[PDB]
Amino acid sequence: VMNRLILAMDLMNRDDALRVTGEVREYIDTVKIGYPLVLSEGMDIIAEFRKRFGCRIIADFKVADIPETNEKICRATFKAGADAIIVHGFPGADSVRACLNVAEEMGREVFLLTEMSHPGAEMFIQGAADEIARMGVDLGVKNYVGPSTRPERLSRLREIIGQDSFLISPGVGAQGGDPGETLRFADAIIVGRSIYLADNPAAAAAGIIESIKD
Amino acid sequence: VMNRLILAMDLMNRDDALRVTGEVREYIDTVKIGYPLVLSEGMDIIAEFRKRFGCRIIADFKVADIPETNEKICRATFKAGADAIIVHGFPGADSVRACLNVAEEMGREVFLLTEMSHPGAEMFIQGAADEIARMGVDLGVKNYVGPSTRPERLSRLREIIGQDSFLISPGVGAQGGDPGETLRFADAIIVGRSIYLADNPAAAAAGIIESIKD
Ligand SMILES: Nc1c(F)c(=O)[nH]c(=O)n1[C@@H]1O[C@H](COP(=O)(O)O)[C@@H](O)[C@H]1O
Numbered sequence: 001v002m003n004r005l006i007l008a009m010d011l012m013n014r015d016d017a018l019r020v021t022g023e024v025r026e027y028i029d030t031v032k033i034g035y036p037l038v039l040s041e042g043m044d045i046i047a048e049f050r051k052r053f054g055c056r057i058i059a060d061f062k063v064a065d066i067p068e069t070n071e072k073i074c075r076a077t078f079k080a081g082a083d084a085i086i087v088h089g090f091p092g093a094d095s096v097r098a099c100l101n102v103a104e105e106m107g108r109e110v111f112l113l114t115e116m117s118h119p120g121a122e123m124f125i126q127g128a129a130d131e132i133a134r135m136g137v138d139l140g141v142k143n144y145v146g147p148s149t150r151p152e153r154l155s156r157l158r159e160i161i162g163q164d165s166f167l168i169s170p171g172v173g174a175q176g177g178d179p180g181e182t183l184r185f186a187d188a189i190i191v192g193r194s195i196y197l198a199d200n201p202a203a204a205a206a207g208i209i210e211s212i213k214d
Numbered sequence: 215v216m217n218r219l220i221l222a223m224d225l226m227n228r229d230d231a232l233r234v235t236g237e238v239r240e241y242i243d244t245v246k247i248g249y250p251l252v253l254s255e256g257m258d259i260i261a262e263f264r265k266r267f268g269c270r271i272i273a274d275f276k277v278a279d280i281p282e283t284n285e286k287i288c289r290a291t292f293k294a295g296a297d298a299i300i301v302h303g304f305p306g307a308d309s310v311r312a313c314l315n316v317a318e319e320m321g322r323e324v325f326l327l328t329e330m331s332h333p334g335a336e337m338f339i340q341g342a343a344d345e346i347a348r349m350g351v352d353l354g355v356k357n358y359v360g361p362s363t364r365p366e367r368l369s370r371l372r373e374i375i376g377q378d379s380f381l382i383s384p385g386v387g388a389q390g391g392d393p394g395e396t397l398r399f400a401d402a403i404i405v406g407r408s409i410y411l412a413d414n415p416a417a418a419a420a421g422i423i424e425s426i427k428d
């Protein structure tokens with residue numbers, strides 16, 4: 001991922017999302033698009049971004065349904081041009097394998113979300129997260145998401161998935177995570193508000209990149 | 215809910231979804247629309263259904279993000295005209311309260327998903343589900359989802375949320391759940407494929423209603 005930095009583009013109107021993404025494009029290779037933007041502007045926004053910026057797109061849909069519904073969500077998402085989809089592990093192995101099967105059919109990839117970055121993740125997700133990660137390994141998952149806000153958890157998750165797996169990490173900036181500490185364990189960081197709410201998003205991106213080039 | 219039966223409309227093209235929903239409308243009051251249909255046809259499908267059928271709409275989005283993202287997803291969903299949204303409890307209390315706050319602002323309702331109906335729910339969700347339900351009660355949640363496929367779990371969940379709470383239950387028909395047994399505990403059942411894949415969806419709906427009128 002260019003500069004190890006993934007933009008979380010959670011602005012909800014197309015003109016602002018296009019402006020900010022264009023402004024920071026010299027600093028990123030990869031944009032995470034989630035439901036805030038997709039439910040406001042439509043699934044066609046994925047192909048628009050992919051074309052206009054020549055960026056890879058991760059669909060952050062935190063897929064969390066039964067296997068049959070997960071299969072449908074994944075097929076619609078890859079049809080729309082997404083390169084990868086984020087899938088929750090908490091609903092269990094059959095729900096994850098349904099997503100992996102569609103990704104295998106469509107030549108796409110699944111990111112398994114293990115532990116989440118927000119405080120409420122401590123209630124139920126954290127206690128299951130090591131086991132969710134192991135389940136991923138056992139299913140052949142190669143791409144994972146884990147929390148910038150808890151680098152000791154991010155270290156453990158790295159220890160389970162091994163060095164060859166690809167690990168991306170949200171919670172940097174607004175939620176309190178640090179770029180450099182997070183990159184001790186993750187391959188790339190995800191950053192939303194610290195960039196997209198900045199008075200100068202390009203300067204904010206450049207500042208983050210500076211802080212991690214060294 | 216009319217006849218205690220909620221249609222899970224998971225067909226992915228608008229013409230088929232409109233046909234089947236129109237055919238079974240004399241038997242239902244309430245349609246659950248999820249991401250299979252919304253990601254294929256757009257969020258405008260919610261208002262279209264609400265107008266064309268004069269049905270209530272539950273947006274089955276199994277919201278499962280951090281509080282800030284959950285707030286956005288809920289606002290976009292209620293803006294599109296949904297009456298209610300299904301929210302996962304597994305990400306914890308702050309993520310649920312974010313949805314409750316937007317529902318309170320928009321005059322809408324949240325359904326808390328406790329235990330899911332598919333086999334993989336046994337891995338991580340089932341062991342947390344009683345505690346998820348209690349958390350709902352502690353947050354003032356009045357509407358819940360629990361599994362037709364495990365009526366002993368559905369009985370326990372009813373015992374936690376009490377008799378005044380409203381409980382809906384998927385997993386009837388295709389997944390193995392029984393309409394009448396499920397309605398010992400749930401106020402309404404959710405049915406998808408057993409209706410929408412039937413050669414005659416109206417006859418399938420009518421058959422289910424017959425089996426539970428007695
Ligand atoms: N995908 C995520 C997770 F798995 C997770 O555990 N925590 C997250 O924040 N996100 C997303 O990452 C972004 C964080 O944005 P920012 O805080 O503004 O920098 C948002 O899109 C979140 O929905």
Ligand SMILES: Nc1c(F)c(=O)[nH]c(=O)n1[C@@H]1O[C@H](COP(=O)(O)O)[C@@H](O)[C@H]1O
Pocket residue numbers: 065066069222224248274300327329330331332359360361384385386387388389404405406407408
């Ligand atoms: N909302 C759900 C849950 F919380 C859950 O635990 N299990 C489910 O199946 N659904 C949804 O209920 C419907 C079940 O559809 P059918 O099997 O064809 O009858 C689908 O839309 C599922 O996504």
